[PDB]
């Protein structure tokens, strides 16, 4: 069992790629998955020891290049949109 | 000058008491974007 990395799991109902953060809400002992307001399955109960974990994707947005302009410089910079460093 | 200065302070207090009791032009631009984002996730279903 590994946590806090962008991993891939198959918990009997889906194959999603993301992280597994420790949640603070306990589920009822009859459910297995969990949706949200945006209609996305982002909470799957672990059947090992009944540990509720949240799902957050690891790919958010894209990259960006900053160019100062012609006849000014030669180097650039890499900018991430919604990717934490 | 003391009459218009008292009427100006009474006009500010009437706007502050009316706004504390939602707006329409600042809510339809958010509700239309919220329903459009909730429609795109429903398109995947």
């Amino acid at each position: 069992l590994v946590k806090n990395k962008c991993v891939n799991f198959n918990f009997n109902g889906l194959t999603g790629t993301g992280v597994l953060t420790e949640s603070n809400k306990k589920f009822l002992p009859f459910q297995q998955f969990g949706r949200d307001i945006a209609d996305t399955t982002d909470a799957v109960r672990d059947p090992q020891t009944l540990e509720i974990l949240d799902i957050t994707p690891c790919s958010f947005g894209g990259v960006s290049v900053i160019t100062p302009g012609t006849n000014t410089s030669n180097q650039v910079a890499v900018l991430y949109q919604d990717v934490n460093c | 000058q003391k009459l218009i200065a008292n009427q100006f302070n009474s006009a500010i207090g009437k706007i502050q008491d009316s706004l504390s009791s939602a707006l329409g032009k600042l809510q339809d631009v958010v509700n239309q974007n919220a329903q459009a984002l909730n429609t795109l996730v429903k398109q995947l279903s």
Binding site: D36, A38, T40, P57, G61 | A22, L23, V30, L37, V41
Partner: peptide
Amino acid sequence: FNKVTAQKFNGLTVLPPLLTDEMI
């Protein structure tokens, strides 16, 4: 600000504007 009031899970990311609420 308190009077008027995830979606990014399906690739619908929200980009921040150039000027925040403090600069406005």
